[PDB]
């Protein structure tokens, strides 16, 4: 049991280091496989594009103090360090929504109260590193024992739904700004529909080559190699199709050029801990403790729930996981990077899951029957390091990256979001709301519990998911992690009252 | 055995009349079913559109002597009479390609021989009537017992492939006349791509609602009713989607207005056999025997092979089939209609097949295995009569028919062509060329015969299919039925020599 209260200072860190580090050279040896190369090519784009999008937004919201170059550099550095020294190399760390919301709120507060923006973040980072060291010292990371399945399912489903909704909404804007009338360009003809054609074609080629992998055609070796290279093939085909057309205008991928700060006129690489143009007030020196707690809670909840999700016993993870070393590494790197004006980072979730299940291997036939079960996962320390190194070096290239339209990437994002839903009991019980009771499968949670009780459980879970989406839509979206934490007392108090012991054991089974 | 030599003159006609006519009131009673209404709505468009297309071509090739109104009237009249008095009401009769080729060749001959055209098509009809009566008298229709599976498979596969190729090629022309440049309409923007979007959406909604029929969602009654109404729902949805857009131009469905001849200035309803403007030469009155034989061969081969294909024992047809009465009716109606200047007609293979398997009912339950065996076919005399009656009255309406784009219908045609390939052993053995030998199913022609022999049989059949397509591509396309007939001696002479006795029974099994 990794999550045990040892009773000694820093004990969990030592246990994780002793458990994971002996399997070190095997991590580098297990990378010799075409599947790893396919995974690198697939995950490179999925890690590169959100950096550009969120960097554009972040440059817009602030006074161009943090832009796209800084986010790229932070992602590269943190990814390389974490994948060299981490305990779970199947984690992809990058910027997200709640971090952006916090950054814009902090900038608004600093502007209103007449303080610097790049100086308060330094003290926030100092308090973060102090808090992380304190928590790892006392072994406070064993509290993730109480994060049951009832919370992981909600988190995973909500994250995937948000991903899908954002990807779909990014296509309505093209139709809005290039409408169908006929007679930074605006008002072009043949753009809003060519984007839709490219996106749909990419999604459908990806799904067809995914289904072809489990078919009965061609020799097994060739069939499996073609199956695990589906996404690169779809991207290549649609890039060439869009390259053939010469007169129509489509939006391309824009990576900034040169390793430089976005606004060199009023910023440097190193930020003075004290004031840089005016003295820093002393009251803020210790008042920085309050937002540090909020940042710590956000990063902690995201990282720990992601690590729980990708380490289920169904997925064949054999080398072990770490809940103490990973949190310390992530928070320490965030706090140190805040000194250079770089943003804080956290484990992604959709990217982490997509990385984890792009390396799984399935048992082939044994006999005609159901969809195969997972055989192994193939953990290694090379894929994430290569992805981070490539994201860092995407500045020297960029003449090639400007030939890739964005609608091609929208189909890949839709494929990621749709595929990531597999393996979640909430999703599987949502299907059972429609099938008649005689068609239900032979799983444990259908035979041992009545149908109506299972439907009541599903309705109670959907209510919480809708309540969580409502908060994030609301302007008071900084309270989302607290509402997420409140689900633990809910299950520990109310659900135990409503449901009997036998129902609770089967519906919320650990494995 | 329907195909037996009775010996008595006109015996086969009497046997078919005695076999089919007692089950008369049941034919009208078995029509009370929502599946029949769905079939009527589906087949109405599939019977209406080719009449318009071939009428346009036929008006172009001749000097506007036969147009679109005449073809519509001929289709309606012949369909009504045949479905009231026929022996196989699951046959849809309409104009096709080889008939068009013959009409253009005959017009060219009459033009460059200083003879009339409409008058010269009356003696052909008279000779056709005489030949049909002679053949029915001597019971010469029993020769369709030598048409083995080796010829029916080739015919069905070639017809479906040609259908698919024509439907795809009709979409390249839109891109050719409305190219993507950007700045009887021509050179419009947003027209080539909206057509593609509408076509793809129609095809995909049709396939989704076809797969939903065999799923496990919703109650059985509602699921099956929604499943058998897939095509009307797809058509309605995409018609509304295209109706929402206001500024973009798309080609619509247009029918002539009024029950009038296309060229009233130089034509009437009744054609004088002796002559209309100049006396008809006596030599042609007798020499018209040569093209009558060719027309008879065309109509005979098409109708008889279609009737053989839809009446396989796998499809549960219990009321019987007619091989004499149907041929007599079709040829007599063609010969009589030629007196009014109306075209001859023959049974359409894809439309007949799509009519036959739009009324089948599938079994269920047990466990997912082979595609559920066909339970029944639900023959009746109402659907085919209603389709022809609606096609006849499609001119009084036509303000509604002008709101239907053509790209919506292209997806329905693609769905028809793709679906019609199911149930053909040639198609099923084409898959087995790719799967490895350890994955072949448990059928009779895999266990009883060595794999390489089966692949040799498939290669020999593909060679004949390619040779048959090459002829119709060639300008000498009037010799296609003779090349088709020549496959009958091939199996009886050469294939019996190459293959042993045991292989021939299993590969070319009657049932």
């Amino acid at each position: 049991d990794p999550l045990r209260r040892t009773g000694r200072p820093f004990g969990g860190l030592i246990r994780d280091v002793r458990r994971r580090y002996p399997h070190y050279l095997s991590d580098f040896r297990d990378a010799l496989d075409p599947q790893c190369l396919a995974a690198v090519i697939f995950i490179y784009f999925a890690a590169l594009s959100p950096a550009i999008t969120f960097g554009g937004l972040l440059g817009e919201k602030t006074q161009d103090l943090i832009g796209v170059s800084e986010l790229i550099m932070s992602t590269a550095l943190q990814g390389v360090v974490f994948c060299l020294l981490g305990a779970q190399p199947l984690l992809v760390i990058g910027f997200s929504g709640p971090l952006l919301v916090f950054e814009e709120a902090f900038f608004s507060f600093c502007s209103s109260n007449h303080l610097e923006y790049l100086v308060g973040r330094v003290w926030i980072g100092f308090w973060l590193v102090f808090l992380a060291l304190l928590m790892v010292a006392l072994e406070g990371s064993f509290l993730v024992r109480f994060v049951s399945r009832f919370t992981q399912e909600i988190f995973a489903f909500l994250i995937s739904l948000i991903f899908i909704y954002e990807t779909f909404y990014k296509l309505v804007k093209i139709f809005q700004e290039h409408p169908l009338h006929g007679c930074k360009p605006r008002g072009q003809p043949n753009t809003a529909l060519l984007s839709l054609v490219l996106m749909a074609g990419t999604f459908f080629i990806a799904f067809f080559l995914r289904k072809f992998k489990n078919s009965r055609f061609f020799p097994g070796r060739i069939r499996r190699v073609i199956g695990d290279f589906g996404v690169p093939i779809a991207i290549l085909i649609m890039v060439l199709v869009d390259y053939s057309i010469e007169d129509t205008y489509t939006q391309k991928l824009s990576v900034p050029s040169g390793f430089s700060v976005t606004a060199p006129e009023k910023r440097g690489w190193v930020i003075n801990p004290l004031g840089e143009k005016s003295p820093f007030p002393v009251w803020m020196m210790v008042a920085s403790l309050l937002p540090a707690i909020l940042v710590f809670i956000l990063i902690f909840m995201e990282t720990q729930i992601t690590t729980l999700i990708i380490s289920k016993k169904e997925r064949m993870l054999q080398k072990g996981s770490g809940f103490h070393l990973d949190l310390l590494l992530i928070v320490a790197m965030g706090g140190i990077c805040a000194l250079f004006g770089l943003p804080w980072l956290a484990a992604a979730t959709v990217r982490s899951v997509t990385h984890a299940n792009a390396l799984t291997v399935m048992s082939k036939a044994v006999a005609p029957g159901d969809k195969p079960k997972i055989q192994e996962v193939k953990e290694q320390r090379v894929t994430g390091l290569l992805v981070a190194l490539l994201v860092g070096l995407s500045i020297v290239i960029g003449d090639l990256l400007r030939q890739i339209p964005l609608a091609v990437l929208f189909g890949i994002f839709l494929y990621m979001g749709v595929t990531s839903l597999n393996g979640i009991q909430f999703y599987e019980r949502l299907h059972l709301l429609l099938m008649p009771p005689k068609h239900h499968p032979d799983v444990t949670y259908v035979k041992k519990v009545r149908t109506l009780r299972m439907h009541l459980f599903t309705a109670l879970q959907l209510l919480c998911l809708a309540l969580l989406w409502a908060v994030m839509s609301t302007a008071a979206s900084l309270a989302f992690p607290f509402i997420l934490i409140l689900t633990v007392p809910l299950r520990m108090v109310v659900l135990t009252r409503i449901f009997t012991d036998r129902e609770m054991k089967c519906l919320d089974a650990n494995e």
Side-chain angles (χ1 to χ4, degrees), chain A:
Chain A
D1 193 359
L3 299 170
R4 214 181 41 71
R5 185 71 174 88
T6 312
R8 291 180 289 114
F10 295 102
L13 184 86
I14 319 166
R15 302 170 61 220
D16 291 331
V17 168
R18 293 181 184 271
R19 169 192 319 138
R20 187 47 195 244
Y21 274 6
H23 312 296
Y24 191 79
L25 183 62
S26 66
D27 286 329
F28 282 94
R29 214 181 281 121
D30 279 27
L32 294 174
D33 207 3
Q35 213 174 355
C36 306
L37 174 58
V40 162
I41 293 169
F42 180 22
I43 305 304
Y44 172 55
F45 292 103
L48 172 70
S49 46
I52 288 174
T53 289
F54 280 120
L57 292 174
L58 193 55
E60 286 194 20
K61 310 255 170 162
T62 78
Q63 293 323 339
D64 203 330
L65 277 157
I66 298 175
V68 181
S69 190
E70 299 179 358
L71 194 40
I72 285 174
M73 266 180 231
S74 163
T75 288
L77 181 61
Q78 296 211 37
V80 172
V81 175
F82 178 82
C83 282
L84 268 192
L85 281 179
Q88 183 77 335
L90 260 53
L91 278 185
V92 182
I93 56 173
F95 210 77
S96 58
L99 301 175
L100 181 82
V101 174
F102 175 77
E103 293 270 43
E104 85 184 9
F106 194 58
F107 186 85
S108 178
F109 175 84
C110 289
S111 88
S112 283
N113 190 359
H114 289 168
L115 280 74
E116 296 96 292
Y117 174 73
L118 287 198
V119 179
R121 286 176 81 252
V122 177
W123 303 108
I124 285 189
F126 285 169
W127 281 118
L128 275 173
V129 69
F130 165 76
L131 280 188
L133 183 63
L134 182 64
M135 182 144 158
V136 175
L138 296 190
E139 307 204 306
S141 182
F142 83 101
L143 309 172
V144 296
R145 293 183 45 259
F146 303 144
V147 177
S148 61
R149 192 197 283 272
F150 186 76
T151 316
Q152 310 161 213
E153 305 293 73
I154 282 173
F155 190 76
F157 204 57
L158 193 64
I159 296 308
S160 296
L161 283 197
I162 298 285
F163 198 69
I164 287 165
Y165 173 99
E166 301 316 290
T167 284
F168 264 121
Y169 174 70
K170 269 191 292 187
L171 185 84
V172 166
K173 281 152 42 201
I174 300 185
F175 270 90
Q176 266 177 16
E177 87 171 311
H178 291 296
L180 306 181
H181 290 328
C183 186
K184 297 172 283 186
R186 204 191 211 71
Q188 303 293 110
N190 302 307
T191 290
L193 284 168
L194 187 58
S195 305
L196 176 58
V197 162
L198 294 175
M199 172 175 151
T202 312
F203 177 88
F204 278 117
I205 297 182
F207 263 59
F208 163 80
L209 277 167
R210 168 190 180 87
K211 304 283 146 213
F212 168 68
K213 194 200 207 180
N214 320 309
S215 76
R216 291 189 294 270
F217 299 89
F218 285 72
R221 300 288 292 275
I222 297 169
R223 166 166 82 255
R224 266 180 271 293
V225 160
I226 304 285
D228 75 28
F229 267 100
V231 167
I233 288 169
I235 283 169
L236 178 72
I237 281 174
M238 291 316 218
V239 162
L240 291 178
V241 162
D242 171 57
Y243 174 80
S244 65
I245 309 165
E246 301 276 19
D247 314 301
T248 310
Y249 151 78
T250 51
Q251 196 175 2
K252 304 286 160 149
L253 193 67
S254 49
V255 177
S257 83
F259 307 81
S260 178
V261 176
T262 60
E265 59 192 340
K266 54 179 179 177
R267 193 190 176 279
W269 285 111
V270 182
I271 297 169
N272 194 41
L274 296 156
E276 58 193 348
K277 66 161 73 82
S278 66
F280 205 54
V282 184
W283 69 270
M284 191 75 198
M285 289 292 195
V286 309
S288 292
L289 185 63
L290 297 201
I293 295 166
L294 182 62
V295 177
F296 187 84
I297 291 169
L298 272 172
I299 300 185
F300 178 80
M301 287 310 282
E302 190 144 39
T303 312
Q304 298 293 268
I305 298 195
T306 306
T307 307
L308 277 172
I309 284 170
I310 68 173
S311 295
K312 269 167 176 165
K313 284 322 320 183
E314 297 88 317
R315 310 164 166 77
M316 291 305 167
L317 277 296
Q318 293 304 130
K319 287 184 181 180
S321 164
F323 294 83
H324 295 85
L325 180 58
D326 284 347
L327 177 76
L328 175 64
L329 270 171
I330 286 184
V331 181
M333 298 177 318
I336 278 178
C337 287
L339 182 56
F340 294 154
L342 274 59
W344 315 303
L345 291 194
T349 298
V350 185
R351 273 133 75 194
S352 293
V353 162
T354 305
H355 188 203
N357 76 10
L359 303 154
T360 69
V361 176
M362 312 295 267
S363 61
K364 301 186 315 177
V366 73
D370 187 28
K371 181 75 177 68
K373 44 162 201 303
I374 299 156
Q375 171 185 299
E376 65 165 2
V377 168
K378 194 198 318 289
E379 322 87 340
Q380 85 272 29
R381 285 250 176 93
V382 167
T383 298
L385 181 65
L386 279 178
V387 167
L389 193 65
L390 288 184
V391 162
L393 281 183
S394 80
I395 298 284
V396 298
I397 72 169
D399 56 355
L400 161 74
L401 286 177
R402 264 161 211 141
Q403 309 300 316
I404 292 172
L406 289 188
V408 170
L409 295 181
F410 290 163
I412 298 304
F413 300 162
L414 205 69
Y415 165 80
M416 288 166 62
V418 161
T419 303
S420 288
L421 294 168
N422 302 341
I424 293 165
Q425 280 203 358
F426 192 22
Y427 188 51
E428 307 189 67
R429 278 195 271 107
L430 272 180
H431 294 173
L432 270 61
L433 279 172
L434 316 168
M435 321 206 298
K438 46 160 307 188
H439 283 113
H440 288 349
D442 203 319
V443 294
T444 301
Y445 54 87
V446 295
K447 308 271 182 282
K448 285 273 160 303
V449 65
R450 299 197 257 123
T451 303
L452 291 203
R453 312 291 286 168
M454 182 179 72
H455 290 348
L456 183 66
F457 196 74
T458 315
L460 285 191
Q461 210 160 1
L462 272 169
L463 182 83
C464 299
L465 189 149
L467 203 74
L468 271 172
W469 207 340
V471 164
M472 286 211 318
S473 293
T474 300
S477 66
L478 273 190
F480 164 67
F482 294 88
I483 309 300
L484 187 67
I485 292 172
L486 291 203
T487 56
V488 174
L490 180 65
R491 175 191 61 81
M492 290 194 142
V493 172
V494 188
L495 290 198
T496 300
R497 174 251 281 181
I498 297 169
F499 289 88
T500 63
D501 163 32
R502 197 141 183 67
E503 279 162 17
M504 272 305 277
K505 266 59 199 193
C506 60
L507 288 160
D508 291 331
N510 295 282
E511 73 264 349

